[PDB]
Amino acid sequence: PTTKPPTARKYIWTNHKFNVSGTPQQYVPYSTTRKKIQEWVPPSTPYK
Amino acid sequence: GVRTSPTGEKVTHTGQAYDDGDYRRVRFSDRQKEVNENFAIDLIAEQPVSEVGSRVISCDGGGGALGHPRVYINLDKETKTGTCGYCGLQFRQPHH
Amino acid sequence: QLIAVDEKLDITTLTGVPEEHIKTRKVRIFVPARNNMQSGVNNTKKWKMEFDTRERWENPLMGWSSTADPLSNLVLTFSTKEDAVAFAEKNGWSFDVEERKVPKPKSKSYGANFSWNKRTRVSTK
Amino acid sequence: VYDQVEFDVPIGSRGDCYDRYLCRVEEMRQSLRIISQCLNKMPPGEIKVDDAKVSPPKRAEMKTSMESLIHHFKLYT
Amino acid sequence: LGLREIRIHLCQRSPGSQGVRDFIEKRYVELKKANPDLPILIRECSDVQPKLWARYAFGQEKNVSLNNFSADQVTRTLENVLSGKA
Amino acid sequence: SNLIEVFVDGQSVMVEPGTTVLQACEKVGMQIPRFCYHERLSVAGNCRMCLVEIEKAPKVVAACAMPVMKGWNILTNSEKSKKAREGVMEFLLANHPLDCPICDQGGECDLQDQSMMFGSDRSRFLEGKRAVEDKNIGPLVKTIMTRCIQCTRCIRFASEIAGVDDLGTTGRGNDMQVGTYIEKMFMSELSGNIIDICPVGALTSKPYAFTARPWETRKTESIDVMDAVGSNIVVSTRTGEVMRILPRMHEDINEEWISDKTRFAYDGLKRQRLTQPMIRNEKGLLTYTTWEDALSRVAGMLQSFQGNDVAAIAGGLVDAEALVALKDLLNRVDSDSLCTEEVFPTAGAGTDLRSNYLLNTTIAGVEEADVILLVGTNPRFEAPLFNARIRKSWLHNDLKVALIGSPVDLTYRYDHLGDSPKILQDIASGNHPFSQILKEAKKPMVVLGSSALQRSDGTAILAAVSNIAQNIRLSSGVTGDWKVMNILHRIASQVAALDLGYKPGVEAIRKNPPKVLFLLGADGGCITRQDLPKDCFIIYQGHHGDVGAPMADVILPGAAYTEKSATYVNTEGRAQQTKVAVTPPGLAREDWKIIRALSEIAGMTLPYDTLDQVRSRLEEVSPNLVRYDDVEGANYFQQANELSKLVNQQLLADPLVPPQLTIKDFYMTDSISRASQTMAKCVKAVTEGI
Amino acid sequence: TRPTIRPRNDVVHKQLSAFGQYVAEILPKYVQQVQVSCFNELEIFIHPDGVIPVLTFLRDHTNAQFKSLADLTAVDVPTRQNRFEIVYNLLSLRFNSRIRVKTYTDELTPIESSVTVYKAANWYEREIWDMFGVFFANHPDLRRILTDYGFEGHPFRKDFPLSGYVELRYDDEVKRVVAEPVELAQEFRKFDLNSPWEAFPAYRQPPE
Amino acid sequence: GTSVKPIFSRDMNEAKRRVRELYRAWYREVPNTVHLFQLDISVKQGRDKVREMFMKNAHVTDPRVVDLLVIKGKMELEETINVWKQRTHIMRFFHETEAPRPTDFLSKFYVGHDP
Amino acid sequence: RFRGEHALRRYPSGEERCIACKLCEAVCPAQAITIEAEPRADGSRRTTRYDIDMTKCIYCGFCQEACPVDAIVEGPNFEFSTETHEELLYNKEKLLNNGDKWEAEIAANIQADYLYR
Ligand code: SF4
Ligand code: SF4
Ligand code: SF4
Ligand code: SF4
Ligand code: FES
Ligand SMILES: [Mg+2]
Ligand SMILES: [Zn+2]
């Protein structure tokens, strides 16, 4: 990469990171979608 | 353009965030929540609109065979701009 | 050399299927309807056997779709309705059979598009 | 193209483990022979059948031609 | 002992329901004249025996068969049900 | 008889005169390629994809339009027809956009599939393609017109089926474009069907955009419950979620179409859903609780009160299983006040005779009538597919249509006789010339809507219509089993409730106010807490939070029609069952199971434990509820007409005004529709348009 | 037929047709059908009672000498009254040829074991019994060969589900591996791939 | 009518005799299985489990099915005697880890949607 | 041509290449890809869920050859062993981060090999 460098992009990481497994920086999987079914919300005032 | 939840969690580009009553937040204790910082919608919103002196323009995303399938965009409507269905780039005829 | 037994066929005890996946399920025997998005009819030729839909829930990790019934993806193909009935009966499954739906023949006439006195005359073509 | 290459088939005589070991070593040598022939007679041309209803089109064709895109979509779905 | 509704399940074409059909087309109207508040439901069986269902208080039900009955016989059975006599 | 003999690839077949080459090939089992031809549309002949060779004829013919002749040998797989197909597909694909990865019609495209089956595998088009600008025709149909192939299917559908002449072609030659030529929304109760008939991704479903692919989806064949037509549908599901609704073909009910509400109101199944049992806390607010607690609280009151102190109201989306379960539960406490919100006059025969409250002519029978009289109804919005059948008969059979009521737009020209109910009396007497019109008819038809029965004149209106029908039968004689009289219903649960012995209307509640009230999905608001005594116990069982839930003491969450196997009977008297597409959300359960569990907890256990046993009970109560496609029934018109002459209720001086006056009143009619955001968008678009 | 189409061999087609007619003439008690495919493969459809005679003939006749049993397997077709079809693939080294013999059976009709004709059949028959539930009479030792010990059912049957009925895990309370009813965190995704618009006119069935 | 080829038995009596022979063999083997695998169950409950597994198929009235069941049971017995199974395979007959499932209508109502 | 850890790429503008055609999900022999999509706030066709289960994946590379826009690729990294099973279940954020991490090498490799594809 000295004689020919990589193409520069603004979204490329400026700081490389090694494998962070077994570390507070480890990746934790989770769902990325929103809730499918919305529940009904009762009125805040009594009926009688 | 990342935001933060009222709890403190980062909101992803899909809008995901556990609510206050969700127990699943416990998975992030002593750990982190992986969030990509570069939001594609904001990044494509910053591109300038290209000006072309033709009614029909073609877009392949740049790079030829390294882009997307080549598509043709009509620019007859002056109310809005033509947008590529793959890339998100915008085109317009030189109004005034 | 031939027993000459007279009884209805039942192989339920030999198939290894758990007890509650025999007498609790309901199979459906039908010719699948044509997908209305398309005009081809090649998928409306054979008879299908399919089981009743059971519960699907969300995986707490990753939010995937989880099931607990082993027959959720089991679809069988048959030449005739009688074959499907025989298979379901010998396998001990209670079934519902729906008769095949066939498009009725239609009278088509291009000349009616341009009618002297009928309402079939078209305003555009 | 096997009928276009020449090689010998090692044959045993006593049908025991030693003869089978010798046969396997000789087949290694004959494979070297066939590989030499294959290296020298490699021909030019395309590498999959020119029938886009079976073999997927090239990426450039997929990204420029309507039929190529349709056949790519259908072959991969 | 309080009657609530009665149900007559008769078939369209089978000969066994013939007399029952006759009763309807001959006398049902007059029956509905005498009992303007009693629901006399008429429903259609298929390849089944004709039947008469009678519902009493607290959901108890009794059914009787009407196979090959004539109009006189079904009239007598219906009068017995309406009066309560055994 | 008059059949002629033709040959398909050398195989003989006898066909009726005027049969097209395409239909003769169909009779052999060969499907000719097509883009512009549709069975239910008029023949166009534009796409030239159906070109086929006739033996010893130098020129190919268009199979979709050309009648076959005696002795013809059709060569479907000949070299000339294959080359014609390849050339036509080349022309179709020359300007088509490379949009397949972003096109919603990707895995279910007739263009894609017929290209793979009958076209070449490569292109030799070395030019630039044309691109056209997109049009806006509303919030339901997304338009991307660069994908258009100019088959004119949408134009023919809009003109002929929907009766709307908004679509056309502008321009000439290569830049001839399908559209409206002005900013105009294509709004009709049947507008979404142009998505299905469009062979390509030019017209797509806007609410469905980019959510699924056709190969992922699981298909459940079920029944629509948004009206009383009972149109057959397919629910598409993926990973336990409903994705879309498609029409399922039934030649007798909906042919191939569905309504816009039926198509797009599934959005409402994801909002305002009841998920857990709820009870009133000490503050008076609804709070969550277990099934045990809620069922015990309901059962305590069910044990405490009995007789006329207990009552139940059934809503418009209730199945027959839950109806019979609730009826049995209330009978076990000696209660007979089982009511529905929709009113039917109980004088005379009432619901004792089934034909007294059915569409006796059936939906298909409209194609056999030559005169029809509509009384106090708007079939366009109350029963869109019934109105479509009327439109089809009007177009093809020269059907004569007249209407008693407000002059609504029915998409076909009809004879307005007026607004006053007294007009019926005139027709019943013979002064009106339309009495002479009906006398001359061979297959006359009189249709009365339930909306005209709700107006407290229902007894007198029904008596007048019955008098007209009796005059027709008496003067014109008995033509056969024609069954002139008809009742057109609006809700999907009314016919099953009337079959099972439910009292139509809510008057019995008004006469004897109860102290325990069951609301089985009742959301019409016809009973308020003002019409009930103080501290009345109200139970709401249902699937949506609507006007019915906030007034209840206990909430029991039930299942929607996509989440159970349930029986519904349409306006013809035809029983049909749905299938489970997904399961109920949260703690919601099947409704009949809820009623059975409540009966067991209360010490009044019902005899049935499975769905099969509940259907056996349904057979015991009304044996037409287990025959799942049968429509034929007995005719007891004479008895009902004789019994309808006893009471002499007078008519009101009040014109018949249907509730569905215009299209903006069509989108929101039930709790599922009111929770739909797509229906809200439709209402907004029709109220103000851009 | 330009370079993308597979070339065809008429001489082998004629030879295989002639040998098929020859075999059918010699053994008319058992042969019900003879076929030669377009890629020159000869199959003989026989009655189940002729498994031992026919095979023996094809192994021992001087004009056949099919001395090698290449493969023995079964195919499950639920729509047929006789569910399973049994396929024998035979290789003749003397004449450099291959042949296929098909027969049929159902869940309750035994098939004669061919271990006395070909020793290779032994394990193959075991495999068939393991995967389809077809019993072979006079087998020297018929038992499961591929499935786990005590496994219930026959997994290669069409009505057997892909993931089975039970799954295994380790339990620390009882300190051993236990079997439980199967639960998947992600259900297998069923795809509807078949298109309308039939692909091959030459295989069209009569519309009945 | 409906002539069918036998497996082993010409009628029901021969099938019953084969069933009794298989049951005798299993009953004899149970104590050896308990001792040799070092199981934690008694001989009494092992024989009770054998009896239960035999009674599970007591409704069969077809000799071909009966002797196919006998062939499978003999295969299972041969697997047990030769110690081809492990302790886990033997213990799988008892489902000691599976949670009890209520047959009551109310309990199944409470737990979920499964009938 | 080496097949390693998966990554999601984007255009030079920073806009992601994936347009949610689901071809990679359809072609995956192991059913290791799970995709969910909806219109974006600007009407763009984008994914809301893109998951790859790396313990089901066979690393065949069929997904990258099925992709029409070079969105999903198999990168050059092979040293990504993990101490738990959970961290091998990749969601969309992880794959976008991998793309942003490895884009330089990925682009150079694609430039070297695309004339054979
Ligand atoms: S309409 Fe069909 S062929 Fe055209 S882009 Fe869409 S899927 Fe592809
Ligand atoms: S929009 Fe669709 S239906 Fe209408 S003309 Fe174009 S291709 Fe045909
Ligand atoms: S590499 Fe193969 S197995 Fe892995 S995700 Fe891609 S297609 Fe699926
Ligand atoms: S990664 Fe590529 S193939 Fe997969 S959905 Fe996105 S665009 Fe389609
Ligand atoms: S289908 Fe005949 S020309 Fe279009
Ligand atoms: Mg379309
Ligand atoms: Zn672009």
From TrEMBL, chain B:
Residue ranges of domain Zinc finger CHCC-type in the record: 55-91
Domain of life: Eukaryota
Chief subcellular location: mitochondrion
Compartment(s) of residence: Mitochondrion inner membrane
Topological relation to the membrane, as annotated: Peripheral membrane protein
Biological processes per GO annotation: cellular senescence; circulatory system development; DNA damage response, signal transduction by p53 class mediator; fatty acid metabolic process; gene expression; kidney development; mesenchymal stem cell differentiation; mesenchymal stem cell proliferation
GO cellular component term of the entry, any: mitochondrial inner membrane
Key words of the record: Electron transport, Membrane, Metal-binding, Mitochondrion, Mitochondrion inner membrane, Respiratory chain, Transit peptide, Transport, Zinc
Positions bound to Zn(2+): 59, 68, 84, 87
Protein's job: Accessory subunit of the mitochondrial membrane respiratory chain NADH dehydrogenase (Complex I), that is believed not to be involved in catalysis. Complex I functions in the transfer of electrons from NADH to the respiratory chain. The immediate electron acceptor for the enzyme is believed to be ubiquinone.
Quaternary organization: Mammalian complex I is composed of 45 different subunits. This is a component of the iron-sulfur (IP) fragment of the enzyme.
Family the UniProt entry places it in: Belongs to the complex I NDUFS6 subunit family.
Protein's recorded name: NADH dehydrogenase [ubiquinone] iron-sulfur protein 6, mitochondrial
UniProtKB/TrEMBL annotation, chain C:
Principal subcellular localization: mitochondrion
Membrane topology reported for the UniProt record: Peripheral membrane protein
GO CC annotation, single: mitochondrial inner membrane
GO biological process, one term: electron transport chain
Cited function: Accessory subunit of the mitochondrial membrane respiratory chain NADH dehydrogenase (Complex I), that is believed not to be involved in catalysis. Complex I functions in the transfer of electrons from NADH to the respiratory chain. The immediate electron acceptor for the enzyme is believed to be ubiquinone.
Subunit structure: This is a component of the iron-sulfur (IP) fragment of the enzyme.
Name under which the protein is recorded: NADH dehydrogenase [ubiquinone] iron-sulfur protein 4, mitochondrial
Organism: Sus scrofa (Pig)
Organism lineage string: Eukaryota, Metazoa, Chordata, Craniata, Vertebrata
Automatic annotation (TrEMBL), chain G:
Subcellular location: Mitochondrion
All residue ranges annotated as the NADH:ubiquinone oxidoreductase 30kDa subunit domain in the record: 46-165
Statement: the UniProt record of this protein carries the keyword Transport: yes
Record flagged with keyword Glycosyltransferase: no
GO cellular component, one term: nuclear body
Main location as per UniProt: mitochondrion
Signal peptide: none
GO MF annotations in UniProt: NADH dehydrogenase (ubiquinone) activity; NADH dehydrogenase activity
Family, similarity comment: Belongs to the complex I 30 kDa subunit family.
Subunit structure: Core subunit of respiratory chain NADH dehydrogenase (Complex I) which is composed of 45 different subunits. Interacts with NDUFAF3. Interacts with RAB5IF. Found in subcomplexes containing subunits NDUFS2, MT-ND1 and NDUFA13.
Its biological purpose: Core subunit of the mitochondrial membrane respiratory chain NADH dehydrogenase (Complex I) which catalyzes electron transfer from NADH through the respiratory chain, using ubiquinone as an electron acceptor. Essential for the catalytic activity and assembly of complex I.
Protein name: NADH dehydrogenase [ubiquinone] iron-sulfur protein 3, mitochondrial
Species whose genome carries this gene: Sus scrofa
Lineage: Eukaryota, Metazoa, Chordata, Craniata, Vertebrata
Gene that produces this protein: NDUFS3
Section of the entire sequence shown: 43 to 250 of 264
TrEMBL record, chain H:
GO cellular component term, pick one: mitochondrial inner membrane
Keyword Electron transport: yes
InterPro entries recorded: Complex1_LYR_dom (IPR008011), Complex1_LYR_NDUFA6_LYRM6 (IPR045299), NADH_Ub_cplx-1_asu_su-6 (IPR016488)
Coiled-coil segments on the chain, per record: none
UniProt entry keywords in alphabetical sequence: Electron transport, Membrane, Mitochondrion, Mitochondrion inner membrane, Respiratory chain, Transport, Ubiquinone
CDD domains: Complex1_LYR_NDUFA6_LYRM6
Pfam families on file: Complex1_LYR
Domain of life according to the entry: Eukaryota
Membrane topology: Peripheral membrane protein
Function according to Swiss-Prot or TrEMBL: Accessory subunit of the mitochondrial membrane respiratory chain NADH dehydrogenase (Complex I), that is believed to be not involved in catalysis. Required for proper complex I assembly. Complex I functions in the transfer of electrons from NADH to the respiratory chain. The immediate electron acceptor for the enzyme is believed to be ubiquinone.
Family according to the record: Belongs to the complex I LYR family.
Subunit structure: Mammalian complex I is composed of 45 different subunits.
Name of this chain's protein: NADH dehydrogenase [ubiquinone] 1 alpha subcomplex subunit 6
The organism of origin for this protein: Sus scrofa (Pig)
